[PDB]
């Protein structure tokens, strides 16, 4: 076990909790319903890159905000997708649940979306070097990105031996606290097993 | 009036000094009912003896936290602070002798994997 999770390193400094609420007696069931919501939303939506899911709770009314790169996919033009999600979130006993569907400004600067894309490309047929290089170039082309590292491990290329490969461009200071490192991880489903993809992205400091 | 504090490894002493006789009122108890340890009493009185202002100050002291030794150290520091506040031109004597320095020695935190702060479990090579 080498490196701790970058989000968990700067949780009280740079990054923010993805669930904002307060509970004293009902902490346990709040956590249970939160993880249920998370797994439901991860399962239901896979076409559009679901970058992040936020939950805010206040008595009866519950606020679930999710960030996607393709809002149109997740919303029914007549509300069909919206109706379906609202309905099965009522089924989740969330009482009154209202949803704020949002959009990421620059998909290529978001580590989770980058890992999602690289994993998808890896799954079907693409050689892993091509995927990592394309992702690195796309993210480096973005104005605010200062350093990106992509690493994927497993039976790469359908081989019998597992391998770890990583390419880096610029600065990725994992030991520096004030540097905000966006961390994203996603497992690629191949016919030969499971390939794990991680992405680190450095975008300056926050003070 | 004047009031200082002394802090020695979590022992906090609040003191009140007036120019009365050298009677020691420690939370309603005297220097012998309290602190029945001769080394401890010497530790209390040492700043006075190096400043030679013994038996010319009434002392009211509040004690809370820690054991007798930490309380005694904090009390001595509080007395030194009261003395420098009352008679500034004695500062060289109290400072050279080291009574004006707060002691930054605290209980070291216990660490996981070790029985104590530094003591480690017995490891068998064989």
């Amino acid at each position: 076990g080498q490196k701790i999770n970058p989000h968990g390193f700067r949780l009280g400094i740079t990054t923010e909790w993805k669930s904002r609420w307060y509970a004293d007696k009902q902490y346990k069931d709040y956590v249970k319903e939160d993880v249920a919501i998370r797994k439901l939303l991860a399962t239901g939506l896979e076409r559009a890159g679901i970058a992040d899911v936020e939950i805010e709770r206040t008595r009866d009314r519950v606020r679930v905000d999710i960030h996607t790169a393709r809002p149109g996919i997740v919303i029914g033009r007549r509300g069909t997708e919206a109706d379906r999600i609202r309905a099965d979130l009522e089924k989740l006993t969330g009482k009154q649940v209202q949803l704020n569907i949002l959009e990421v400004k620059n998909p290529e600067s978001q580590a989770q979306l980058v890992a999602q894309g690289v994993a998808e490309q890896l799954s079907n047929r693409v050689a892993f070097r091509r995927a990592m290089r394309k992702a690195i170039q796309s993210a480096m082309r973005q104005p605010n990105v200062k350093g990106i590292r992509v690493q994927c491990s497993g039976r790469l290329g359908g081989a019998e031996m597992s391998r770890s490969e990583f390419y880096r461009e610029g600065r990725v200071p994992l030991h520096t606290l004030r540097a905000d490192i966006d961390y994203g991880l996603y497992e690629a489903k191949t016919t030969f097993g499971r390939i794990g993809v991680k992405v680190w992205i450095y975008k300056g400091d926050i003070v | 009036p004047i009031q200082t504090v002394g802090r020695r490894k979590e022992a906090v002493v609040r003191v009140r000094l007036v120019p009365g006789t050298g009677q020691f009122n420690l939370d309603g108890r005297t220097l012998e009912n309290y602190f029945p340890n001769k080394v401890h009493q010497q530790l209390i009185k040492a700043p006075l003896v190096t400043v030679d202002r013994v038996d010319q100050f009434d002392i009211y002291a509040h004690l809370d936290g820690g054991g007798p030794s930490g309380q005694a150290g904090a009390l001595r520091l509080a007395i030194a602070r009261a003395l420098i506040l009352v008679q500034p031109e004695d500062r060289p004597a109290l400072k050279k002798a080291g009574f004006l320095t707060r002691d930054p020695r605290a209980i070291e935190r216990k660490k996981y994997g070790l029985k104590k702060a530094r003591k480690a479990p017995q490891y068998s090579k064989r």
């Binding site: 076990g1 904002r20 609420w21 307060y22 004293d24 805010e56 709770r57 206040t58 606020r63 | 996981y112 994997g113």
Partner: protein
């Protein structure tokens, strides 16, 4: 008659902002307050093992910190009461009225 307002949150900044906003509102209504009296921070500590299987000597510690603020007002005019039940605060901080 005075009503106690108790504040509890995991983020000190949010609870401070809530305290100052509540004070501003009640002074807008024309009341007398005491101020955001700070209260001891509650710390809940948890120690776990990193590895799923063995490797026990490797432990990781977590803590949950709760910050408490105390708001007390006087002269409870009905406008102040109505203003109190017309205040919006972040979902992180809960308000106890007693």
């Amino acid at each position: 008659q005075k009503i106690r307002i108790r504040l509890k949150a995991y983020d000190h900044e949010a609870i401070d902002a809530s305290a100052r906003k509540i004070v501003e509102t009640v002074t807008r209504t024309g009341a007398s307050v005491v101020g955001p009296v700070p209260l001891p921070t509650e710390k809940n500590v948890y120690c776990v093992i990193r590895s799923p299987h063995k490797y026990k000597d490797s432990r990781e510690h977590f803590e949950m910190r709760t910050h408490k603020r105390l708001i007390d007002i006087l002269d409870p005019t009905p406008k102040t009461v109505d203003a109190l039940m017309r205040i919006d605060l972040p979902a992180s901080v809960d308000v106890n009225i007693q």
